Structures are given as structure tokens and as C-alpha cells.
mmCIF file of C-alpha atoms and ligand atoms in Angstrom:
data_model
loop_
_atom_site.group_PDB
_atom_site.id
_atom_site.type_symbol
_atom_site.label_atom_id
_atom_site.label_comp_id
_atom_site.label_asym_id
_atom_site.label_seq_id
_atom_site.Cartn_x
_atom_site.Cartn_y
_atom_site.Cartn_z
ATOM 1 C CA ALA B 1 171.165 -141.698 -90.311
ATOM 2 C CA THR B 2 173.363 -138.783 -89.412
ATOM 3 C CA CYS B 3 172.527 -135.387 -90.874
ATOM 4 C CA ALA B 4 175.036 -132.747 -91.975
ATOM 5 C CA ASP B 5 175.011 -131.048 -88.568
ATOM 6 C CA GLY B 6 175.396 -134.234 -86.571
ATOM 7 C CA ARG B 7 171.775 -134.672 -85.497
ATOM 8 C CA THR B 8 170.348 -138.128 -86.134
ATOM 9 C CA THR B 9 167.110 -139.491 -87.612
ATOM 10 C CA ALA B 10 165.971 -142.956 -88.736
ATOM 11 C CA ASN B 11 165.515 -141.857 -92.333
ATOM 12 C CA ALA B 12 167.953 -139.532 -94.066
ATOM 13 C CA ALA B 13 165.160 -137.900 -96.092
ATOM 14 C CA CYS B 14 163.998 -136.368 -92.814
ATOM 15 C CA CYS B 15 167.187 -134.322 -92.376
ATOM 16 C CA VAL B 16 165.632 -131.466 -94.359
ATOM 17 C CA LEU B 17 163.294 -130.900 -91.428
ATOM 18 C CA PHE B 18 165.970 -129.994 -88.872
ATOM 19 C CA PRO B 19 166.567 -126.437 -90.122
ATOM 20 C CA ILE B 20 162.799 -125.983 -90.375
ATOM 21 C CA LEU B 21 162.380 -127.153 -86.770
ATOM 22 C CA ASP B 22 164.956 -124.669 -85.560
ATOM 23 C CA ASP B 23 163.453 -121.803 -87.518
ATOM 24 C CA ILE B 24 159.924 -122.341 -86.305
ATOM 25 C CA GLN B 25 160.863 -122.980 -82.707
ATOM 26 C CA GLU B 26 162.579 -119.610 -82.570
ATOM 27 C CA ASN B 27 160.563 -117.470 -84.963
ATOM 28 C CA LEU B 28 157.064 -118.935 -84.819
ATOM 29 C CA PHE B 29 156.950 -120.312 -81.235
ATOM 30 C CA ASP B 30 158.881 -117.576 -79.376
ATOM 31 C CA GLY B 31 161.723 -119.879 -78.406
ATOM 32 C CA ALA B 32 159.898 -123.219 -78.118
ATOM 33 C CA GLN B 33 157.021 -122.045 -75.920
ATOM 34 C CA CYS B 34 153.474 -123.400 -75.673
ATOM 35 C CA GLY B 35 151.829 -120.070 -76.350
ATOM 36 C CA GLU B 36 149.704 -118.173 -78.832
ATOM 37 C CA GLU B 37 151.291 -119.445 -82.007
ATOM 38 C CA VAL B 38 151.247 -123.068 -80.876
ATOM 39 C CA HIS B 39 147.549 -122.733 -80.108
ATOM 40 C CA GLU B 40 146.866 -121.100 -83.476
ATOM 41 C CA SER B 41 149.025 -123.568 -85.401
ATOM 42 C CA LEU B 42 147.225 -126.488 -83.736
ATOM 43 C CA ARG B 43 143.863 -124.993 -84.720
ATOM 44 C CA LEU B 44 145.237 -124.575 -88.249
ATOM 45 C CA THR B 45 145.979 -128.293 -88.514
ATOM 46 C CA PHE B 46 142.276 -128.940 -87.960
ATOM 47 C CA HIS B 47 140.973 -126.191 -90.230
ATOM 48 C CA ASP B 48 143.230 -127.480 -92.995
ATOM 49 C CA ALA B 49 142.505 -131.196 -92.472
ATOM 50 C CA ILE B 50 138.771 -131.108 -91.825
ATOM 51 C CA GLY B 51 138.173 -129.653 -95.296
ATOM 52 C CA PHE B 52 137.555 -133.185 -96.461
ATOM 53 C CA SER B 53 134.200 -134.683 -97.387
ATOM 54 C CA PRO B 54 133.577 -137.677 -99.660
ATOM 55 C CA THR B 55 130.360 -136.020 -100.722
ATOM 56 C CA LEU B 56 131.390 -132.381 -100.909
ATOM 57 C CA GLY B 57 135.117 -132.511 -101.791
ATOM 58 C CA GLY B 58 138.248 -130.956 -100.389
ATOM 59 C CA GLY B 59 141.611 -132.633 -100.045
ATOM 60 C CA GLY B 60 142.017 -132.761 -96.279
ATOM 61 C CA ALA B 61 145.468 -132.179 -94.812
ATOM 62 C CA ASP B 62 146.795 -130.683 -98.034
ATOM 63 C CA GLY B 63 147.846 -127.134 -97.209
ATOM 64 C CA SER B 64 144.849 -125.740 -99.073
ATOM 65 C CA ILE B 65 144.181 -123.175 -96.346
ATOM 66 C CA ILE B 66 147.552 -121.593 -97.276
ATOM 67 C CA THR B 67 147.680 -122.343 -101.028
ATOM 68 C CA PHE B 68 144.080 -121.175 -101.502
ATOM 69 C CA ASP B 69 144.096 -118.670 -98.679
ATOM 70 C CA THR B 70 142.272 -116.067 -100.763
ATOM 71 C CA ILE B 71 139.232 -118.340 -100.738
ATOM 72 C CA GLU B 72 139.474 -120.194 -97.439
ATOM 73 C CA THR B 73 140.438 -117.362 -95.106
ATOM 74 C CA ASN B 74 137.155 -115.654 -96.021
ATOM 75 C CA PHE B 75 134.945 -118.495 -94.706
ATOM 76 C CA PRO B 76 133.154 -117.429 -91.475
ATOM 77 C CA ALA B 77 134.429 -120.439 -89.519
ATOM 78 C CA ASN B 78 137.983 -119.415 -90.434
ATOM 79 C CA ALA B 79 137.494 -116.184 -88.529
ATOM 80 C CA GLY B 80 140.791 -115.400 -86.901
ATOM 81 C CA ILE B 81 142.794 -118.064 -88.656
ATOM 82 C CA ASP B 82 144.032 -115.637 -91.084
ATOM 83 C CA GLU B 83 146.771 -114.291 -88.780
ATOM 84 C CA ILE B 84 148.482 -117.663 -88.395
ATOM 85 C CA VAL B 85 148.117 -118.412 -92.125
ATOM 86 C CA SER B 86 149.928 -115.157 -92.892
ATOM 87 C CA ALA B 87 152.593 -115.977 -90.318
ATOM 88 C CA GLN B 88 153.226 -119.472 -91.694
ATOM 89 C CA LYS B 89 153.372 -118.507 -95.368
ATOM 90 C CA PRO B 90 156.912 -117.091 -95.385
ATOM 91 C CA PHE B 91 158.247 -120.271 -93.762
ATOM 92 C CA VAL B 92 156.699 -122.357 -96.485
ATOM 93 C CA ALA B 93 158.197 -120.069 -99.127
ATOM 94 C CA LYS B 94 161.706 -120.226 -97.682
ATOM 95 C CA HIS B 95 162.038 -123.942 -96.820
ATOM 96 C CA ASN B 96 161.004 -126.076 -99.839
ATOM 97 C CA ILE B 97 158.403 -128.116 -97.945
ATOM 98 C CA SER B 98 154.794 -128.472 -99.140
ATOM 99 C CA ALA B 99 152.267 -126.330 -97.314
ATOM 100 C CA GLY B 100 150.390 -129.437 -96.193
ATOM 101 C CA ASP B 101 153.519 -130.904 -94.665
ATOM 102 C CA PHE B 102 154.425 -127.574 -93.065
ATOM 103 C CA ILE B 103 151.047 -127.126 -91.367
ATOM 104 C CA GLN B 104 151.151 -130.578 -89.789
ATOM 105 C CA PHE B 105 154.841 -130.268 -88.890
ATOM 106 C CA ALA B 106 154.349 -126.920 -87.176
ATOM 107 C CA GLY B 107 151.355 -128.257 -85.274
ATOM 108 C CA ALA B 108 153.274 -131.299 -84.057
ATOM 109 C CA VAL B 109 156.351 -129.271 -83.123
ATOM 110 C CA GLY B 110 154.154 -126.794 -81.264
ATOM 111 C CA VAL B 111 152.274 -129.391 -79.232
ATOM 112 C CA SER B 112 155.610 -130.898 -78.218
ATOM 113 C CA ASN B 113 156.449 -127.656 -76.390
ATOM 114 C CA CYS B 114 153.524 -128.090 -74.013
ATOM 115 C CA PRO B 115 154.078 -129.811 -70.658
ATOM 116 C CA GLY B 116 152.033 -132.998 -70.586
ATOM 117 C CA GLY B 117 152.053 -133.025 -74.360
ATOM 118 C CA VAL B 118 152.741 -135.668 -76.954
ATOM 119 C CA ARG B 119 154.872 -136.232 -80.033
ATOM 120 C CA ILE B 120 152.264 -136.527 -82.789
ATOM 121 C CA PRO B 121 153.421 -138.924 -85.542
ATOM 122 C CA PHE B 122 154.653 -136.887 -88.495
ATOM 123 C CA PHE B 123 154.957 -138.005 -92.135
ATOM 124 C CA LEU B 124 156.687 -136.116 -94.946
ATOM 125 C CA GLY B 125 155.764 -135.889 -98.627
ATOM 126 C CA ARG B 126 152.256 -134.492 -99.173
ATOM 127 C CA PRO B 127 151.791 -133.118 -102.695
ATOM 128 C CA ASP B 128 150.709 -129.529 -103.143
ATOM 129 C CA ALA B 129 146.955 -128.887 -102.833
ATOM 130 C CA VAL B 130 144.865 -128.946 -105.987
ATOM 131 C CA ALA B 131 141.518 -127.611 -104.760
ATOM 132 C CA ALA B 132 140.218 -125.285 -102.096
ATOM 133 C CA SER B 133 138.154 -126.694 -99.290
ATOM 134 C CA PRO B 134 134.431 -126.139 -99.651
ATOM 135 C CA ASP B 135 132.926 -123.761 -97.095
ATOM 136 C CA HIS B 136 130.863 -125.084 -94.178
ATOM 137 C CA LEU B 137 133.127 -128.038 -93.376
ATOM 138 C CA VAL B 138 134.549 -126.639 -90.111
ATOM 139 C CA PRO B 139 132.352 -127.219 -87.035
ATOM 140 C CA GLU B 140 131.018 -124.094 -85.299
ATOM 141 C CA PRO B 141 130.463 -123.635 -81.554
ATOM 142 C CA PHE B 142 126.737 -123.079 -82.131
ATOM 143 C CA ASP B 143 126.385 -126.364 -84.050
ATOM 144 C CA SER B 144 124.504 -129.137 -82.274
ATOM 145 C CA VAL B 145 126.153 -132.321 -81.090
ATOM 146 C CA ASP B 146 124.338 -134.177 -83.867
ATOM 147 C CA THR B 147 125.636 -131.722 -86.473
ATOM 148 C CA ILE B 148 129.203 -131.836 -85.150
ATOM 149 C CA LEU B 149 129.274 -135.620 -84.888
ATOM 150 C CA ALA B 150 127.816 -135.962 -88.386
ATOM 151 C CA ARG B 151 130.424 -133.589 -89.861
ATOM 152 C CA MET B 152 133.316 -135.216 -88.049
ATOM 153 C CA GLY B 153 131.911 -138.630 -88.937
ATOM 154 C CA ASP B 154 131.725 -137.594 -92.593
ATOM 155 C CA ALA B 155 135.457 -136.934 -92.433
ATOM 156 C CA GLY B 156 136.015 -140.338 -90.796
ATOM 157 C CA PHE B 157 135.913 -139.752 -87.012
ATOM 158 C CA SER B 158 133.829 -141.648 -84.504
ATOM 159 C CA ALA B 159 132.141 -139.864 -81.617
ATOM 160 C CA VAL B 160 134.808 -140.958 -79.148
ATOM 161 C CA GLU B 161 137.493 -139.668 -81.532
ATOM 162 C CA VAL B 162 135.852 -136.225 -81.487
ATOM 163 C CA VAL B 163 136.156 -136.182 -77.687
ATOM 164 C CA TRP B 164 139.784 -137.249 -77.955
ATOM 165 C CA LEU B 165 140.605 -134.524 -80.466
ATOM 166 C CA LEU B 166 138.993 -131.922 -78.187
ATOM 167 C CA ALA B 167 141.881 -132.417 -75.780
ATOM 168 C CA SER B 168 143.267 -129.653 -78.047
ATOM 169 C CA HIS B 169 141.014 -127.256 -76.120
ATOM 170 C CA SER B 170 143.299 -127.835 -73.120
ATOM 171 C CA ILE B 171 145.855 -125.603 -74.916
ATOM 172 C CA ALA B 172 143.572 -123.067 -76.530
ATOM 173 C CA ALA B 173 141.922 -119.663 -76.416
ATOM 174 C CA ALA B 174 139.232 -117.689 -78.221
ATOM 175 C CA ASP B 175 139.709 -114.355 -79.912
ATOM 176 C CA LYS B 176 136.525 -114.053 -81.977
ATOM 177 C CA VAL B 177 133.757 -115.706 -79.925
ATOM 178 C CA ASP B 178 133.705 -112.660 -77.660
ATOM 179 C CA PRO B 179 135.899 -110.012 -79.261
ATOM 180 C CA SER B 180 135.745 -107.868 -76.101
ATOM 181 C CA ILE B 181 137.942 -110.446 -74.324
ATOM 182 C CA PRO B 182 140.370 -111.780 -76.916
ATOM 183 C CA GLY B 183 142.832 -114.433 -75.792
ATOM 184 C CA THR B 184 140.573 -115.957 -73.158
ATOM 185 C CA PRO B 185 141.401 -119.652 -72.673
ATOM 186 C CA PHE B 186 139.119 -122.650 -72.543
ATOM 187 C CA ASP B 187 140.828 -123.987 -69.413
ATOM 188 C CA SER B 188 142.831 -122.544 -66.570
ATOM 189 C CA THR B 189 146.072 -124.018 -67.917
ATOM 190 C CA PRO B 190 146.335 -123.022 -71.618
ATOM 191 C CA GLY B 191 150.078 -123.674 -71.559
ATOM 192 C CA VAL B 192 149.672 -127.214 -70.183
ATOM 193 C CA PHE B 193 148.287 -130.208 -72.072
ATOM 194 C CA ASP B 194 146.223 -131.681 -69.237
ATOM 195 C CA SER B 195 142.749 -132.732 -68.232
ATOM 196 C CA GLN B 196 141.724 -129.353 -66.775
ATOM 197 C CA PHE B 197 139.604 -128.651 -69.867
ATOM 198 C CA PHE B 198 137.535 -131.825 -69.330
ATOM 199 C CA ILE B 199 137.076 -130.963 -65.635
ATOM 200 C CA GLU B 200 136.263 -127.289 -66.017
ATOM 201 C CA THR B 201 133.756 -127.780 -68.830
ATOM 202 C CA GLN B 202 131.837 -130.114 -66.469
ATOM 203 C CA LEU B 203 131.436 -127.425 -63.791
ATOM 204 C CA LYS B 204 128.263 -125.462 -63.342
ATOM 205 C CA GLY B 205 128.499 -122.202 -65.251
ATOM 206 C CA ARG B 206 128.541 -119.031 -63.149
ATOM 207 C CA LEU B 207 129.239 -115.960 -65.255
ATOM 208 C CA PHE B 208 129.956 -114.516 -68.673
ATOM 209 C CA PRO B 209 133.625 -113.447 -68.722
ATOM 210 C CA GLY B 210 132.962 -110.617 -71.174
ATOM 211 C CA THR B 211 129.643 -109.643 -72.717
ATOM 212 C CA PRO B 212 126.525 -111.714 -72.079
ATOM 213 C CA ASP B 213 125.029 -112.600 -75.500
ATOM 214 C CA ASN B 214 127.587 -114.061 -77.915
ATOM 215 C CA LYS B 215 126.582 -116.748 -80.349
ATOM 216 C CA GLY B 216 128.086 -120.110 -79.489
ATOM 217 C CA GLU B 217 129.048 -119.119 -75.926
ATOM 218 C CA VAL B 218 127.554 -120.183 -72.599
ATOM 219 C CA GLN B 219 128.461 -119.238 -69.027
ATOM 220 C CA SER B 220 131.902 -120.083 -67.742
ATOM 221 C CA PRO B 221 132.699 -121.224 -64.186
ATOM 222 C CA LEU B 222 135.642 -118.805 -63.911
ATOM 223 C CA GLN B 223 136.507 -115.233 -64.764
ATOM 224 C CA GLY B 224 139.233 -115.437 -67.326
ATOM 225 C CA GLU B 225 137.893 -118.613 -68.959
ATOM 226 C CA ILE B 226 135.405 -118.832 -71.811
ATOM 227 C CA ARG B 227 133.066 -121.727 -72.511
ATOM 228 C CA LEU B 228 131.797 -122.785 -75.907
ATOM 229 C CA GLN B 229 128.242 -124.012 -76.264
ATOM 230 C CA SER B 230 129.541 -127.007 -78.243
ATOM 231 C CA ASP B 231 131.926 -128.042 -75.480
ATOM 232 C CA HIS B 232 129.171 -127.566 -72.883
ATOM 233 C CA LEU B 233 126.901 -129.874 -74.860
ATOM 234 C CA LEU B 234 129.524 -132.499 -75.700
ATOM 235 C CA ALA B 235 130.396 -132.795 -72.003
ATOM 236 C CA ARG B 236 126.744 -133.481 -71.116
ATOM 237 C CA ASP B 237 124.995 -135.137 -74.071
ATOM 238 C CA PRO B 238 124.360 -138.867 -73.633
ATOM 239 C CA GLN B 239 126.282 -139.676 -76.825
ATOM 240 C CA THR B 240 129.576 -138.264 -75.555
ATOM 241 C CA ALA B 241 129.355 -137.520 -71.825
ATOM 242 C CA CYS B 242 130.772 -140.810 -70.593
ATOM 243 C CA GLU B 243 133.783 -140.541 -72.887
ATOM 244 C CA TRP B 244 134.289 -136.912 -71.848
ATOM 245 C CA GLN B 245 134.357 -137.806 -68.170
ATOM 246 C CA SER B 246 136.708 -140.722 -68.829
ATOM 247 C CA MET B 247 139.381 -138.187 -69.822
ATOM 248 C CA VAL B 248 139.316 -136.510 -66.377
ATOM 249 C CA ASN B 249 142.486 -137.257 -64.413
ATOM 250 C CA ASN B 250 143.448 -139.729 -67.138
ATOM 251 C CA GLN B 251 146.567 -138.186 -68.555
ATOM 252 C CA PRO B 252 147.802 -141.415 -70.229
ATOM 253 C CA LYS B 253 144.526 -141.716 -72.126
ATOM 254 C CA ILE B 254 144.508 -138.065 -73.179
ATOM 255 C CA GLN B 255 148.086 -138.493 -74.429
ATOM 256 C CA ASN B 256 147.586 -141.753 -76.303
ATOM 257 C CA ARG B 257 144.260 -140.889 -77.865
ATOM 258 C CA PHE B 258 145.184 -137.334 -78.859
ATOM 259 C CA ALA B 259 148.385 -138.413 -80.551
ATOM 260 C CA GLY B 260 146.774 -141.248 -82.442
ATOM 261 C CA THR B 261 143.705 -139.308 -83.516
ATOM 262 C CA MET B 262 145.825 -136.295 -84.533
ATOM 263 C CA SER B 263 147.887 -138.610 -86.712
ATOM 264 C CA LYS B 264 144.683 -139.758 -88.388
ATOM 265 C CA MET B 265 143.599 -136.149 -88.845
ATOM 266 C CA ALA B 266 147.012 -135.140 -90.248
ATOM 267 C CA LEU B 267 146.651 -137.851 -92.870
ATOM 268 C CA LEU B 268 143.132 -137.024 -94.124
ATOM 269 C CA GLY B 269 143.231 -137.014 -97.914
ATOM 270 C CA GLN B 270 146.698 -138.634 -97.878
ATOM 271 C CA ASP B 271 148.133 -142.142 -98.081
ATOM 272 C CA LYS B 272 150.676 -142.907 -95.409
ATOM 273 C CA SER B 273 152.325 -145.550 -97.619
ATOM 274 C CA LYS B 274 153.478 -142.832 -100.019
ATOM 275 C CA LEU B 275 154.973 -140.673 -97.275
ATOM 276 C CA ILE B 276 158.097 -141.006 -95.140
ATOM 277 C CA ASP B 277 157.958 -141.389 -91.385
ATOM 278 C CA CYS B 278 159.798 -138.418 -89.806
ATOM 279 C CA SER B 279 158.286 -138.730 -86.360
ATOM 280 C CA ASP B 280 161.660 -138.636 -84.613
ATOM 281 C CA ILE B 281 162.324 -135.048 -85.729
ATOM 282 C CA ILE B 282 159.544 -133.842 -83.424
ATOM 283 C CA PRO B 283 160.899 -132.845 -79.988
ATOM 284 C CA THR B 284 160.219 -134.807 -76.819
ATOM 285 C CA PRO B 285 157.547 -133.015 -74.793
ATOM 286 C CA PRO B 286 158.027 -132.084 -71.151
ATOM 287 C CA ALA B 287 156.185 -134.038 -68.495
ATOM 288 C CA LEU B 288 152.939 -132.761 -67.094
ATOM 289 C CA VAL B 289 153.134 -130.080 -64.562
ATOM 290 C CA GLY B 290 150.432 -129.891 -61.955
ATOM 291 C CA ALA B 291 147.719 -132.487 -61.419
ATOM 292 C CA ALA B 292 143.997 -132.650 -61.996
ATOM 293 C CA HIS B 293 142.077 -130.484 -59.595
ATOM 294 C CA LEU B 294 138.931 -128.524 -59.051
ATOM 295 C CA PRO B 295 139.505 -124.770 -59.048
ATOM 296 C CA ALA B 296 140.162 -123.164 -55.679
ATOM 297 C CA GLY B 297 136.993 -122.798 -53.643
ATOM 298 C CA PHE B 298 135.033 -125.318 -55.720
ATOM 299 C CA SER B 299 133.733 -128.681 -54.565
ATOM 300 C CA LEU B 300 132.357 -131.818 -56.142
ATOM 301 C CA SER B 301 128.825 -130.460 -55.885
ATOM 302 C CA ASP B 302 129.833 -127.867 -58.514
ATOM 303 C CA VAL B 303 130.328 -130.699 -61.034
ATOM 304 C CA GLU B 304 127.387 -131.463 -63.332
ATOM 305 C CA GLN B 305 127.794 -135.203 -63.510
ATOM 306 C CA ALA B 306 126.494 -136.520 -66.817
ATOM 307 C CA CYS B 307 127.656 -140.162 -66.972
ATOM 308 C CA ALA B 308 124.967 -142.341 -65.379
ATOM 309 C CA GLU B 309 127.218 -145.375 -65.191
ATOM 310 C CA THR B 310 130.277 -143.957 -63.563
ATOM 311 C CA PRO B 311 130.472 -141.278 -60.906
ATOM 312 C CA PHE B 312 132.787 -138.330 -61.523
ATOM 313 C CA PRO B 313 136.125 -138.911 -59.838
ATOM 314 C CA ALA B 314 136.717 -137.433 -56.391
ATOM 315 C CA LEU B 315 139.057 -134.553 -57.179
ATOM 316 C CA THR B 316 140.214 -132.074 -54.600
ATOM 317 C CA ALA B 317 140.244 -128.298 -55.020
ATOM 318 C CA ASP B 318 143.381 -126.189 -55.131
HETATM 319 C C1 LIG I 401 134.610 -130.524 -82.512
HETATM 320 C C2 LIG I 401 134.244 -129.286 -82.840
HETATM 321 C C3 LIG I 401 135.028 -128.013 -82.571
HETATM 322 C C4 LIG I 401 134.488 -126.797 -82.414
HETATM 323 C C5 LIG I 401 133.021 -126.404 -82.512
HETATM 324 C C6 LIG I 401 135.553 -125.876 -82.134
HETATM 325 C C7 LIG I 401 135.428 -124.511 -81.947
HETATM 326 C C8 LIG I 401 136.434 -123.616 -81.647
HETATM 327 C C9 LIG I 401 136.278 -122.206 -81.466
HETATM 328 C C10 LIG I 401 134.963 -121.452 -81.609
HETATM 329 C C11 LIG I 401 137.465 -121.697 -81.132
HETATM 330 C C12 LIG I 401 137.813 -120.238 -80.841
HETATM 331 C C13 LIG I 401 138.094 -119.452 -82.113
HETATM 332 C C14 LIG I 401 138.251 -117.991 -81.785
HETATM 333 O O1 LIG I 401 137.222 -117.353 -81.470
HETATM 334 O O2 LIG I 401 139.400 -117.476 -81.809
HETATM 335 C C15 LIG I 401 138.418 -122.783 -81.119
HETATM 336 C C16 LIG I 401 139.777 -122.677 -80.851
HETATM 337 C C17 LIG I 401 140.707 -123.696 -80.950
HETATM 338 N N1 LIG I 401 140.444 -124.960 -81.443
HETATM 339 FE FE1 LIG I 401 138.572 -125.826 -81.543
HETATM 340 N N2 LIG I 401 136.741 -126.575 -82.124
HETATM 341 C C18 LIG I 401 136.454 -127.885 -82.434
HETATM 342 C C19 LIG I 401 137.416 -128.854 -82.612
HETATM 343 C C20 LIG I 401 138.784 -128.700 -82.587
HETATM 344 C C21 LIG I 401 139.742 -129.703 -82.919
HETATM 345 C C22 LIG I 401 139.369 -131.093 -83.421
HETATM 346 C C23 LIG I 401 140.955 -129.168 -82.777
HETATM 347 C C24 LIG I 401 142.246 -129.930 -82.998
HETATM 348 C C25 LIG I 401 143.355 -129.415 -83.458
HETATM 349 C C26 LIG I 401 140.802 -127.808 -82.310
HETATM 350 C C27 LIG I 401 141.770 -126.963 -81.887
HETATM 351 C C28 LIG I 401 141.618 -125.684 -81.411
HETATM 352 C C29 LIG I 401 142.654 -124.885 -80.841
HETATM 353 C C30 LIG I 401 144.068 -125.310 -80.529
HETATM 354 C C31 LIG I 401 142.073 -123.600 -80.568
HETATM 355 C C32 LIG I 401 142.746 -122.403 -79.951
HETATM 356 C C33 LIG I 401 143.104 -121.337 -80.986
HETATM 357 C C34 LIG I 401 143.746 -120.137 -80.358
HETATM 358 O O3 LIG I 401 144.205 -120.122 -79.233
HETATM 359 O O4 LIG I 401 143.701 -119.072 -81.115
HETATM 360 N N3 LIG I 401 139.452 -127.545 -82.227
HETATM 361 N N4 LIG I 401 137.764 -123.945 -81.450
HETATM 362 CA CA1 LIG I 402 142.746 -128.480 -96.545
HETATM 363 CA CA1 LIG I 403 145.248 -127.096 -70.090
HETATM 364 ZN ZN1 LIG I 404 154.526 -114.938 -79.814
HETATM 365 ZN ZN1 LIG I 405 147.345 -114.535 -82.638
HETATM 366 ZN ZN1 LIG I 406 122.188 -135.696 -78.213
#
């Protein structure tokens, strides 16, 4: 189909998204960059969607975190989500899209700005949310592997899918874990969707980048990077370590698995058969820049190998 402005899409119902795309690329993502607001919007997709429990309730990827912001933005795990919720709200108000659709659309558009990134499948038509998420459904960095895997499993994700989703931490920073060093990334390339996160989390810790006693934080290998306890554990625990290492220098796998698992996440609480496929509105991401490496000065002996079956691959240092 051909939209009013000449841009094309497989389904004409998707044409409504083109002005939304343009508006967010300029006014949410600073001119289509893979920066702060992309990182925050990607986190928001998860905090919206993971509010889904057969036992406890919540409608998943339903926009509840916006619609019921007064409740959800006060949950402790939603610390520091409230800025991006406030930023997204006016776009929802001005564009006649449900909040659930908008959150997933913005997340997919944002990821597509990141070199190495993917075009996450995007479906249009989620109804407005009808309940707030319960509290305590978002994993915390001080939660154990067993707790995290049980929570994610409750929502429908296998252990390997949790690892795949954590490729998000390749384009990510922390503002609240250590509030003395806001904006500190989880890998050395927070503007590049790459395997550096899976490499750098496997390194021996060396230092605390800010203060030395924050809940849910462990030592980082690098000044200017922060390491979550949860990521530290997931990289090393026997239940997940082999899958974690399999992501290292495996860009095609990171791409394929992140896109597919994000689509699953974006559809929690929804039925794809009642939605319209608008995947081709999402921009084409740039190719990866750079290549998997150890940080400058590091060597393979700095890697804490945790997969008994398969040795860590022989990366070189910058
Ligand atoms: C599996 C358990 C997970 C835990 C324990 C966890 C924990 C965290 C924490 C503590 C932060 C930093 C918040 C702050 O202090 O500002 C963070 C940031 C982030 N998380 Fe995760 N996360 C998990 C899974 C995910 C998943 C599945 C996604 C997928 C979308 C995701 C995407 C992000 C992104 C993109 C950021 C960066 C936000 C920014 O730059 O402000 N996380 N996460
Ligand atoms: Ca929700
Ligand atoms: Ca990265
Ligand atoms: Zn900005
Ligand atoms: Zn911010
Ligand atoms: Zn374990």
C-alpha cells in the first residue's frame, strides 16, 4: 500500500504510524540516535510487559505503566522509569495510538537506531489497559538467579530466553543503582548493540566505579562501567552460563534471538491474531560497528570462564 505521503507499507492500516515514527525519531530520540531515550524506552517495554502473571494478574504489554502511572511509577523497581513515562505521555495523547502500542513501537523504533541492532516485529491494535500491574513483578538486580528465572518463567520465558533478552544490557545504563554515578553503562559500547556486554560481564571485577556498597551492584572491570549482581550471577551460574558465553562474538545469534524474544515480550497479554503486522514501518538498523574484543590491556586470563563444556573464545584485546 501507498500512504498519503508516498511512503509504502504492506498493510494500509499501518500508515497511521508514519507520522508517529517521524515525531519520535526527532523529539524523543534526538534525531534517530541510540542514546538515553532509546535505552529508557527499551527498559519501558520490559517494565510494561513483564507486569503479567497468571497467578497474580496484570495485562502484560498493555500500556498500563502509562495509563496507571500514578500506581506503577511508585513501585520501587520502577525507580527512574518515571522520566521516560512522563516523556512518552504527550506523544500518546497527540497521536491516537493506544499506550500499549506506543510503548512497543517506540522501543522497536529506538532499537533500530543502534548499530548492530534489529527490527523487532511490531503489531498494531492493543486495546487500552484495564488494570494496573501488581507490584513485585519486575526483577531486581539483587534477586537470585532462581528468583529471576522463576519470575521470567511465570511470564512465559525459558532460561535461555532470559539470556537472550539481556542483550538489551548492551545498550543500557544505570541511574539509580549508584546515584553518585548516574548514566554509567553496562558495557563499553552503550550506543552499539553488540556482544561487549556478554564479554565484559565475564571479566574479573576490579573496582567499584562510584561508591562501594550499593545493593544489587558488584565490582566492575572498568572505570565508567557498572555491573549488576544479577548479570554477574547469570553469566556464571550453571543454569545460564553456557548460554551467556554462546552470545560472545555471535552477533547473528544476538540479533535473531533478541528480535524474536522481544516480539514475544511485546505480545504478553495480547493475541497476535487480533493485531495487524506493521513490522515494515520500523527502520532498518545500521550494521554493527566494531567487533568483539577484550578491553585494552586485558587478556584471556581476565575472563572467568564458567562453561565447563566449551572454552571461552580466543578474543584479542584492543
Ligand atoms: C532479567 C532481569 C533484569 C534485571 C535484574 C534488570 C535490572 C536492571 C537495572 C537494575 C537497571 C538499571 C536501572 C537504573 O538504575 O537506572 C536496568 C537497566 C536497563 N534494563 Fe534491565 N534488567 C533485567 C532485564 C531486562 C530486560 C529483559 C530488558 C529488555 C528490554 C531490560 C532492559 C534494560 C535497559 C535497556 C536498561 C537501561 C535503562 C537506561 O539506560 O536508563 N532489562 N536493568
Ligand atoms: Ca503493563
Ligand atoms: Ca554495547
Ligand atoms: Zn536526548
Ligand atoms: Zn533519562
Ligand atoms: Zn544456580
